[PDB]
């Protein structure tokens, strides 16, 4: 029986933020969520998240996914684990304690940790790693025969102890029953005057209880994020992880070290992604689609065989074979039908665009229902706002909207209609009709 | 006498692509072409490229540059070399065998390899290297006195052999006459059930024939591209190589690790290139020209003293002192004369623009022949498409095209003419004349 | 008493530039300025900058901040120091000699260097470092008991000496009085036929004078920039330094290795900066402001809570809560009031924009004084240029400028006025009035 305790009540002073540290994002989701996803790998029967500093913000993120306990005052990591007593005290099993600021630890690593704990029949197992720059991390102190003696914090470590490269990742597995009894013996006699969870290791050794340490196969997973310098490193490692997975899946990257793809983004095989492409949120990219430098897609679905050249697309659906850009902007609630062509300096907002329709230049399409095979001449402006209300415009199939025209909603351009270039349309244009609304040209010789 | 055999018939399963692996691009050209260019350094009397999987695509790339032999079934690298028998069997000389998926090996390295082979009078010389992650590479097995015994593939290697860091690059030089006789002794008794070319090393040792190994000076050249993770590494190394050459040539780079310049791009001294600039194909950049972040140039010629700010330029010519951007788009078959200024949100397509002409904002110039010292007011739209045909517009010198005007082709604006702002022009405007075609302003008090 | 000598007279041949090497920029300022800033840390009583090659360009950069001496001919680093004789000869104190092409050395390092020199009572102290690629650097030659014997240049070094990893940084501290007497003994007997300053070390040893070497704590500071490859490395290290400082200060960076922020840019806590953001010159960013990929800001002030999405802003002021982009361009001498919204494909030039005003699409606002709560419809074009003169337009508060309208200066749109969409305005529109200037729509059935 496995139990889990996630610490997320800290102040995170070094972050210099009003937003709780654990909520800072890494590849699209908070560090806390990355940790929560890893925890699920051990299939815990009970999950408790310790909240305190701005608990309401934290509870909203994991609402309905974990039990919450409040730590009124941030008196220490050990004190935080004590808050889980009313829920876990008495139960029999292996209790995992993990920090909410170590977003790189994988579920696979946590599984190996618990398996090690059970196999070696330890009362406490520490997840460790080694690094050439252990500053800020608790050091793992062992004796001559490599037996774990205790964990000494940076601020409490001697110069000899500071030289230790083996660090505490902040993740452990404790025998649930022995954990809460050992917690009662933690004192505040240290540089911070806090209840260190790291002290339970020394406490267990007093009664000769078995304590071990499982070393991470990948030391990059050990990153503890206390400031924004560490947060950038987490972004770097997570970015490499995500992009590596995509490349193994058959996605080409001109530069995986400079491409920004969120954790839950899905990408089909044969997709070509240039450097400096950004894909955020619930974004999906179809097979063989090409994304060029500067393309920025948020919560959108893009089909197969599409080519998105240096363009921004938000909360929209893009069908197969759609060509967009460069410098195009597809705003929320828009839908581009199959083989639609949206060129440079074109903005589509809250509009549905039928198959094969083209708007290649300096055009604004807002709140419009557009048919198939429609052609928007360069400079076409649709007007949906008058100062108070928002009106809709309907454009039929095979409509030819003349260049530099101004279409004032609410109006409807019937099938096969034509709007003369430079015209201002304020009234419906019947199907197959031709509308012209501009001044006559007069030349004055000189 | 040197001969060359390039293997390009494989399936490249790990790539997860319909495009033959060797055809995947690195810095603008296929891996196969990079390998072909290196091969030329040995000045081979005969060059044979083994094709099989989608041979027609491969033959098109190197058409008229090498002899081709078909390998109906991909039974192995050794089997592939056997396909070159009808052409190379009997001839006397040093035969180089190279894979089409090792695009980083230089011609200089191949020259050193053949020179080593001849000097040491070997029957077979293997191009080797060392790496901390030899996974997937054939390991070089030597005895106590560092003599090459054989090459063992990843899938056939024991745990002891897998620990070997010295890898086979897939490039060798064989005595042509002894090569084809040793090929007859290759068996399919291995994990893949294939005819390994790597086995000829062991076969030569049976008759006490001299086999050696030449080690690469630069281990980065040893990269074997079997998947897209490796392809990204190839892009990274090739990108560093290309940009290093440019910096030595006097080109400044804010960030050479994040600048994307194709293999055949030419850049003059004193050019300043910000990070995230992309130069593709047959692009040439003149002296002292400045390219800012986001600029993307494809198959174009840009002169000296030009400033291309965050703009995309395709298949066009840009003269000296031209200023473009930010967010400008120069489309195919366009020509910008000396000191032309193209500003933000301006698109030029299939048009010639005379010296000193300015179009600084929200303008579309398509299929136009424009003179010198012309001024396009912001919002100027030229119309060349009516729904079926494409018409041309001619604009003379010193013409002042009023802002937000719509010029409907085919029309001609004579020298020194002026088009009033907001006008729709459907007829020719004589030289020195003034054309106005808009509605009169009426104010309604309230 | 501390004195300083900065060498900036060299030709910098490897740079292949008409601009003196020391003037090449690193993070917004010349290498010379970075060196000058570091020098100030030792609080020198006298500062002398040796100029020669294009001295006028160099003197302009540090005008009024240092004394200048001319080196007519570039006969060597030793010869350059000799030019400072008329000013420093006779004085008593510690004289620091530093190259103008080592922009990474910090003031803290120079302080530690002088303190070492004084403490050890040396006649000469060399600032050294160690590197695996010492090519081009003078090597530090020591004896069995680690005593500094001399400095041997790359071109004069034997194969044994070339293997030395300890390099000369080009920075030293000499006893002023003994310095000028030792300079008289420097000869041109070397590969370059120049007067090496490095030779004074050997000269001092002839009379048994105390010479030492202080080693840099950070070897990255030792970079000597002789070509553009080294200049890119300097940019890389300086970029990392600058961004690290910002992260410690509470600024988040998606990718600090690919974000370009100049040396004097100021950024408040809680600011979020995506990768590929460029901030240049005297730019200041307020608290909680978000900067997305592609944003490029030069000499501008941006307030708190602003969101600059993929936009370019130059020499302008942006107030709190302003939303800009994507693909917007704020040109010189513009001011955006609190909560102003500037959308895609909008250019603002030399204009003041009042609070809450919105221009969300394809609009050009030039030389305009705009009030508060004004709404610019998509496609709105302001005209300020007629061919010779520049005219101003004044727009009152709560004005509704209809889409695709053309406003021809000089004109004034009074408070609460409205311009009908597609209108060309050539005359003043009184407050509360409605102006319409377009052609009537005529439909022709078919
Ligand atoms: C005493 C202790 O455990 N030290 C460990 C902690 O140091 P470190 O100094 O990083 O500890 P933090 O301040 O980041 O706290 C760790 C976690 O506990 C939380 N928290 C903190 C204080 C509190 O009163 N309530 C609460 O819930 C924080 O929100 C965070 O999720 O993690 C490092 C690894 O990353 C380890 O090397 C250290 O050995
Ligand atoms: C058996 C063999 O040679 N193994 C070598 C091969 O492994 P590796 O597993 O990389 O071999 P690949 O599958 O990439 O084949 C190598 C080359 O031969 C071609 N090909 C393959 C099979 C075929 O039947 N016909 C054909 O033409 C492929 O197109 C490719 O150009 O290259 C590695 C270096 O990169 C070496 O370390 C391995 O020792
Ligand atoms: C002889 C000498 O000093 N060599 C040092 C110099 O080599 P390095 O070959 O780099 O010397 P440079 O040519 O860059 O000259 C150094 C500095 O002196 C200036 N200059 C040069 C020649 C001249 O006649 N007048 C003049 O003012 C240059 O402008 C530059 O600021 O710096 C390296 C560190 O970066 C050291 O490892 C070398 O030991
Ligand atoms: Mg922590
Ligand atoms: Mg291979
Ligand atoms: Mg130098
Ligand atoms: Na217009």
PDB file of C-alpha atoms in Angstrom, chain A residues 215-403:
ATOM      1  CA  UNK A 215      20.482   6.976  -6.618  1.00  0.00           C
ATOM      2  CA  UNK A 216      18.834   8.497  -9.710  1.00  0.00           C
ATOM      3  CA  UNK A 217      20.010   7.065 -13.033  1.00  0.00           C
ATOM      4  CA  UNK A 218      19.673  10.542 -14.547  1.00  0.00           C
ATOM      5  CA  UNK A 219      21.084  13.307 -12.328  1.00  0.00           C
ATOM      6  CA  UNK A 220      19.229  15.974 -14.338  1.00  0.00           C
ATOM      7  CA  UNK A 221      16.050  14.873 -12.549  1.00  0.00           C
ATOM      8  CA  UNK A 222      17.431  16.046  -9.192  1.00  0.00           C
ATOM      9  CA  UNK A 223      16.932  19.770  -9.864  1.00  0.00           C
ATOM     10  CA  UNK A 224      15.419  21.650  -6.943  1.00  0.00           C
ATOM     11  CA  UNK A 225      13.842  24.918  -8.060  1.00  0.00           C
ATOM     12  CA  UNK A 226      14.291  27.625  -5.413  1.00  0.00           C
ATOM     13  CA  UNK A 227      14.803  30.627  -7.715  1.00  0.00           C
ATOM     14  CA  UNK A 228      14.259  31.699 -11.327  1.00  0.00           C
ATOM     15  CA  UNK A 229      17.754  30.616 -12.383  1.00  0.00           C
ATOM     16  CA  UNK A 230      16.807  27.053 -11.417  1.00  0.00           C
ATOM     17  CA  UNK A 231      13.363  27.463 -13.033  1.00  0.00           C
ATOM     18  CA  UNK A 232      15.062  28.271 -16.376  1.00  0.00           C
ATOM     19  CA  UNK A 233      17.162  25.114 -16.009  1.00  0.00           C
ATOM     20  CA  UNK A 234      13.964  23.113 -15.393  1.00  0.00           C
ATOM     21  CA  UNK A 235      12.473  24.618 -18.564  1.00  0.00           C
ATOM     22  CA  UNK A 236      15.640  23.633 -20.436  1.00  0.00           C
ATOM     23  CA  UNK A 237      15.612  19.997 -19.280  1.00  0.00           C
ATOM     24  CA  UNK A 238      11.841  19.592 -19.711  1.00  0.00           C
ATOM     25  CA  UNK A 239      12.060  21.182 -23.189  1.00  0.00           C
ATOM     26  CA  UNK A 240      14.799  18.716 -24.169  1.00  0.00           C
ATOM     27  CA  UNK A 241      12.717  15.819 -22.799  1.00  0.00           C
ATOM     28  CA  UNK A 242       9.548  16.835 -24.670  1.00  0.00           C
ATOM     29  CA  UNK A 243      11.332  17.485 -27.985  1.00  0.00           C
ATOM     30  CA  UNK A 244      13.343  14.262 -27.757  1.00  0.00           C
ATOM     31  CA  UNK A 245      10.071  12.340 -27.461  1.00  0.00           C
ATOM     32  CA  UNK A 246       8.756  14.117 -30.564  1.00  0.00           C
ATOM     33  CA  UNK A 247      11.895  13.354 -32.570  1.00  0.00           C
ATOM     34  CA  UNK A 248      11.722   9.662 -31.592  1.00  0.00           C
ATOM     35  CA  UNK A 249       8.091   9.838 -32.774  1.00  0.00           C
ATOM     36  CA  UNK A 250       9.242  10.976 -36.220  1.00  0.00           C
ATOM     37  CA  UNK A 251       9.135  14.771 -35.931  1.00  0.00           C
ATOM     38  CA  UNK A 252      12.011  16.775 -37.426  1.00  0.00           C
ATOM     39  CA  UNK A 253      13.455  19.738 -35.493  1.00  0.00           C
ATOM     40  CA  UNK A 254      15.971  22.169 -37.006  1.00  0.00           C
ATOM     41  CA  UNK A 255      16.885  23.076 -33.414  1.00  0.00           C
ATOM     42  CA  UNK A 256      15.255  21.140 -30.519  1.00  0.00           C
ATOM     43  CA  UNK A 257      17.190  23.309 -28.026  1.00  0.00           C
ATOM     44  CA  UNK A 258      15.366  26.419 -29.269  1.00  0.00           C
ATOM     45  CA  UNK A 259      11.822  25.158 -29.931  1.00  0.00           C
ATOM     46  CA  UNK A 260       9.106  25.677 -27.323  1.00  0.00           C
ATOM     47  CA  UNK A 261       6.494  22.929 -27.067  1.00  0.00           C
ATOM     48  CA  UNK A 262       4.228  22.454 -24.045  1.00  0.00           C
ATOM     49  CA  UNK A 263       3.971  19.166 -22.147  1.00  0.00           C
ATOM     50  CA  UNK A 264       0.569  18.093 -23.521  1.00  0.00           C
ATOM     51  CA  UNK A 265       1.039  19.118 -27.164  1.00  0.00           C
ATOM     52  CA  UNK A 266       0.460  16.273 -29.646  1.00  0.00           C
ATOM     53  CA  UNK A 267       2.388  16.094 -32.922  1.00  0.00           C
ATOM     54  CA  UNK A 268       2.005  13.531 -35.713  1.00  0.00           C
ATOM     55  CA  UNK A 269       4.866  11.861 -37.595  1.00  0.00           C
ATOM     56  CA  UNK A 270       6.548  13.606 -40.553  1.00  0.00           C
ATOM     57  CA  UNK A 271       5.872  17.078 -39.129  1.00  0.00           C
ATOM     58  CA  UNK A 272       8.709  19.538 -39.832  1.00  0.00           C
ATOM     59  CA  UNK A 273       9.378  22.121 -37.142  1.00  0.00           C
ATOM     60  CA  UNK A 274      11.879  24.926 -37.676  1.00  0.00           C
ATOM     61  CA  UNK A 275      13.672  26.511 -34.747  1.00  0.00           C
ATOM     62  CA  UNK A 276      11.837  29.096 -32.657  1.00  0.00           C
ATOM     63  CA  UNK A 277       8.371  27.618 -33.096  1.00  0.00           C
ATOM     64  CA  UNK A 278       6.054  27.842 -30.063  1.00  0.00           C
ATOM     65  CA  UNK A 279       3.210  25.369 -29.421  1.00  0.00           C
ATOM     66  CA  UNK A 280       1.175  25.887 -26.256  1.00  0.00           C
ATOM     67  CA  UNK A 281      -1.687  24.243 -24.391  1.00  0.00           C
ATOM     68  CA  UNK A 282      -4.071  21.752 -25.958  1.00  0.00           C
ATOM     69  CA  UNK A 283      -2.495  22.033 -29.408  1.00  0.00           C
ATOM     70  CA  UNK A 284      -2.492  19.186 -31.954  1.00  0.00           C
ATOM     71  CA  UNK A 285      -0.519  19.090 -35.219  1.00  0.00           C
ATOM     72  CA  UNK A 286      -1.425  16.752 -38.086  1.00  0.00           C
ATOM     73  CA  UNK A 287       0.875  14.626 -40.252  1.00  0.00           C
ATOM     74  CA  UNK A 288       3.381  16.216 -42.648  1.00  0.00           C
ATOM     75  CA  UNK A 289       2.535  19.740 -41.491  1.00  0.00           C
ATOM     76  CA  UNK A 290       5.297  22.358 -41.733  1.00  0.00           C
ATOM     77  CA  UNK A 291       5.791  24.998 -39.004  1.00  0.00           C
ATOM     78  CA  UNK A 292       8.294  27.785 -39.741  1.00  0.00           C
ATOM     79  CA  UNK A 293      10.330  30.053 -37.454  1.00  0.00           C
ATOM     80  CA  UNK A 294       8.163  32.376 -35.347  1.00  0.00           C
ATOM     81  CA  UNK A 295       4.951  30.348 -35.632  1.00  0.00           C
ATOM     82  CA  UNK A 296       3.073  30.520 -32.321  1.00  0.00           C
ATOM     83  CA  UNK A 297       0.081  28.216 -31.753  1.00  0.00           C
ATOM     84  CA  UNK A 298      -2.073  28.158 -28.599  1.00  0.00           C
ATOM     85  CA  UNK A 299      -4.900  25.687 -27.822  1.00  0.00           C
ATOM     86  CA  UNK A 300      -5.508  24.951 -31.503  1.00  0.00           C
ATOM     87  CA  UNK A 301      -5.919  21.979 -33.818  1.00  0.00           C
ATOM     88  CA  UNK A 302      -4.014  22.014 -37.106  1.00  0.00           C
ATOM     89  CA  UNK A 303      -4.578  19.300 -39.704  1.00  0.00           C
ATOM     90  CA  UNK A 304      -2.306  17.344 -42.020  1.00  0.00           C
ATOM     91  CA  UNK A 305      -0.295  18.804 -44.896  1.00  0.00           C
ATOM     92  CA  UNK A 306      -0.747  22.350 -43.592  1.00  0.00           C
ATOM     93  CA  UNK A 307       1.983  25.009 -43.782  1.00  0.00           C
ATOM     94  CA  UNK A 308       2.015  27.595 -41.005  1.00  0.00           C
ATOM     95  CA  UNK A 309       4.606  30.220 -41.889  1.00  0.00           C
ATOM     96  CA  UNK A 310       5.601  32.650 -39.109  1.00  0.00           C
ATOM     97  CA  UNK A 311       2.014  33.058 -37.858  1.00  0.00           C
ATOM     98  CA  UNK A 312       0.085  33.208 -34.590  1.00  0.00           C
ATOM     99  CA  UNK A 313      -2.975  30.962 -34.136  1.00  0.00           C
ATOM    100  CA  UNK A 314      -5.179  30.957 -31.034  1.00  0.00           C
ATOM    101  CA  UNK A 315      -8.099  28.747 -29.940  1.00  0.00           C
ATOM    102  CA  UNK A 316      -8.960  27.773 -33.497  1.00  0.00           C
ATOM    103  CA  UNK A 317      -9.251  24.831 -35.844  1.00  0.00           C
ATOM    104  CA  UNK A 318      -7.219  24.612 -39.045  1.00  0.00           C
ATOM    105  CA  UNK A 319      -8.086  21.850 -41.545  1.00  0.00           C
ATOM    106  CA  UNK A 320      -5.867  19.822 -43.884  1.00  0.00           C
ATOM    107  CA  UNK A 321      -3.780  21.607 -46.511  1.00  0.00           C
ATOM    108  CA  UNK A 322      -4.284  25.094 -45.069  1.00  0.00           C
ATOM    109  CA  UNK A 323      -1.564  27.632 -45.933  1.00  0.00           C
ATOM    110  CA  UNK A 324      -1.039  30.511 -43.495  1.00  0.00           C
ATOM    111  CA  UNK A 325       1.420  33.401 -43.438  1.00  0.00           C
ATOM    112  CA  UNK A 326       3.859  34.897 -43.118  1.00  0.00           C
ATOM    113  CA  UNK A 327       2.681  37.306 -40.390  1.00  0.00           C
ATOM    114  CA  UNK A 328      -0.943  36.156 -40.240  1.00  0.00           C
ATOM    115  CA  UNK A 329      -3.058  36.148 -37.083  1.00  0.00           C
ATOM    116  CA  UNK A 330      -5.849  33.634 -36.476  1.00  0.00           C
ATOM    117  CA  UNK A 331      -7.692  34.740 -33.349  1.00  0.00           C
ATOM    118  CA  UNK A 332     -10.017  32.758 -31.001  1.00  0.00           C
ATOM    119  CA  UNK A 333     -13.037  30.823 -32.219  1.00  0.00           C
ATOM    120  CA  UNK A 334     -12.026  30.758 -35.870  1.00  0.00           C
ATOM    121  CA  UNK A 335     -12.164  27.793 -38.236  1.00  0.00           C
ATOM    122  CA  UNK A 336     -10.222  27.496 -41.491  1.00  0.00           C
ATOM    123  CA  UNK A 337     -11.595  24.925 -43.906  1.00  0.00           C
ATOM    124  CA  UNK A 338      -9.581  22.540 -46.049  1.00  0.00           C
ATOM    125  CA  UNK A 339      -7.045  24.203 -48.360  1.00  0.00           C
ATOM    126  CA  UNK A 340      -7.856  27.741 -47.177  1.00  0.00           C
ATOM    127  CA  UNK A 341      -5.082  30.271 -47.933  1.00  0.00           C
ATOM    128  CA  UNK A 342      -4.502  33.099 -45.426  1.00  0.00           C
ATOM    129  CA  UNK A 343      -1.624  35.354 -46.473  1.00  0.00           C
ATOM    130  CA  UNK A 344       0.447  38.131 -44.950  1.00  0.00           C
ATOM    131  CA  UNK A 345      -1.025  40.779 -42.668  1.00  0.00           C
ATOM    132  CA  UNK A 346      -4.388  39.025 -42.455  1.00  0.00           C
ATOM    133  CA  UNK A 347      -6.403  38.700 -39.258  1.00  0.00           C
ATOM    134  CA  UNK A 348      -9.272  36.226 -38.862  1.00  0.00           C
ATOM    135  CA  UNK A 349     -11.355  36.548 -35.676  1.00  0.00           C
ATOM    136  CA  UNK A 350     -14.390  34.530 -34.547  1.00  0.00           C
ATOM    137  CA  UNK A 351     -15.132  33.477 -38.119  1.00  0.00           C
ATOM    138  CA  UNK A 352     -15.697  30.253 -40.049  1.00  0.00           C
ATOM    139  CA  UNK A 353     -13.946  30.087 -43.421  1.00  0.00           C
ATOM    140  CA  UNK A 354     -15.124  27.540 -45.996  1.00  0.00           C
ATOM    141  CA  UNK A 355     -12.923  25.318 -48.173  1.00  0.00           C
ATOM    142  CA  UNK A 356     -10.523  26.848 -50.712  1.00  0.00           C
ATOM    143  CA  UNK A 357     -11.259  30.426 -49.647  1.00  0.00           C
ATOM    144  CA  UNK A 358      -8.363  32.873 -50.042  1.00  0.00           C
ATOM    145  CA  UNK A 359      -7.514  36.069 -48.162  1.00  0.00           C
ATOM    146  CA  UNK A 360      -3.904  36.713 -49.078  1.00  0.00           C
ATOM    147  CA  UNK A 361      -3.279  40.286 -47.939  1.00  0.00           C
ATOM    148  CA  UNK A 362      -3.970  43.088 -45.464  1.00  0.00           C
ATOM    149  CA  UNK A 363      -7.443  41.845 -44.608  1.00  0.00           C
ATOM    150  CA  UNK A 364      -9.543  41.746 -41.451  1.00  0.00           C
ATOM    151  CA  UNK A 365     -12.278  39.106 -41.231  1.00  0.00           C
ATOM    152  CA  UNK A 366     -14.217  39.374 -37.981  1.00  0.00           C
ATOM    153  CA  UNK A 367     -17.442  37.688 -36.859  1.00  0.00           C
ATOM    154  CA  UNK A 368     -18.108  36.351 -40.366  1.00  0.00           C
ATOM    155  CA  UNK A 369     -19.535  33.119 -41.736  1.00  0.00           C
ATOM    156  CA  UNK A 370     -17.694  32.665 -45.036  1.00  0.00           C
ATOM    157  CA  UNK A 371     -18.458  30.089 -47.710  1.00  0.00           C
ATOM    158  CA  UNK A 372     -16.179  28.103 -49.998  1.00  0.00           C
ATOM    159  CA  UNK A 373     -14.012  29.381 -52.862  1.00  0.00           C
ATOM    160  CA  UNK A 374     -14.412  32.990 -51.729  1.00  0.00           C
ATOM    161  CA  UNK A 375     -11.709  35.483 -52.681  1.00  0.00           C
ATOM    162  CA  UNK A 376     -10.911  38.463 -50.459  1.00  0.00           C
ATOM    163  CA  UNK A 377      -8.992  41.124 -52.330  1.00  0.00           C
ATOM    164  CA  UNK A 378      -6.058  42.774 -50.559  1.00  0.00           C
ATOM    165  CA  UNK A 379      -7.159  45.466 -48.109  1.00  0.00           C
ATOM    166  CA  UNK A 380     -10.624  44.008 -47.483  1.00  0.00           C
ATOM    167  CA  UNK A 381     -12.021  45.195 -44.150  1.00  0.00           C
ATOM    168  CA  UNK A 382     -15.083  43.708 -42.457  1.00  0.00           C
ATOM    169  CA  UNK A 383     -16.788  45.875 -39.812  1.00  0.00           C
ATOM    170  CA  UNK A 384     -18.544  44.145 -36.911  1.00  0.00           C
ATOM    171  CA  UNK A 385     -18.331  46.797 -34.171  1.00  0.00           C
ATOM    172  CA  UNK A 386     -20.173  50.145 -34.159  1.00  0.00           C
ATOM    173  CA  UNK A 387     -19.371  51.388 -30.654  1.00  0.00           C
ATOM    174  CA  UNK A 388     -21.794  49.346 -28.546  1.00  0.00           C
ATOM    175  CA  UNK A 389     -22.964  46.267 -30.466  1.00  0.00           C
ATOM    176  CA  UNK A 390     -21.372  43.464 -32.479  1.00  0.00           C
ATOM    177  CA  UNK A 391     -22.966  42.488 -35.814  1.00  0.00           C
ATOM    178  CA  UNK A 392     -22.549  39.410 -38.018  1.00  0.00           C
ATOM    179  CA  UNK A 393     -21.858  39.193 -41.758  1.00  0.00           C
ATOM    180  CA  UNK A 394     -22.610  36.204 -43.969  1.00  0.00           C
ATOM    181  CA  UNK A 395     -20.654  35.660 -47.183  1.00  0.00           C
ATOM    182  CA  UNK A 396     -21.778  32.988 -49.636  1.00  0.00           C
ATOM    183  CA  UNK A 397     -19.764  30.632 -51.832  1.00  0.00           C
ATOM    184  CA  UNK A 398     -17.699  31.830 -54.810  1.00  0.00           C
ATOM    185  CA  UNK A 399     -17.976  35.470 -53.718  1.00  0.00           C
ATOM    186  CA  UNK A 400     -15.365  37.901 -55.023  1.00  0.00           C
ATOM    187  CA  UNK A 401     -14.789  40.679 -52.495  1.00  0.00           C
ATOM    188  CA  UNK A 402     -13.002  43.494 -54.317  1.00  0.00           C
ATOM    189  CA  UNK A 403      -9.753  44.862 -52.939  1.00  0.00           C
TER     190      UNK A 403
END
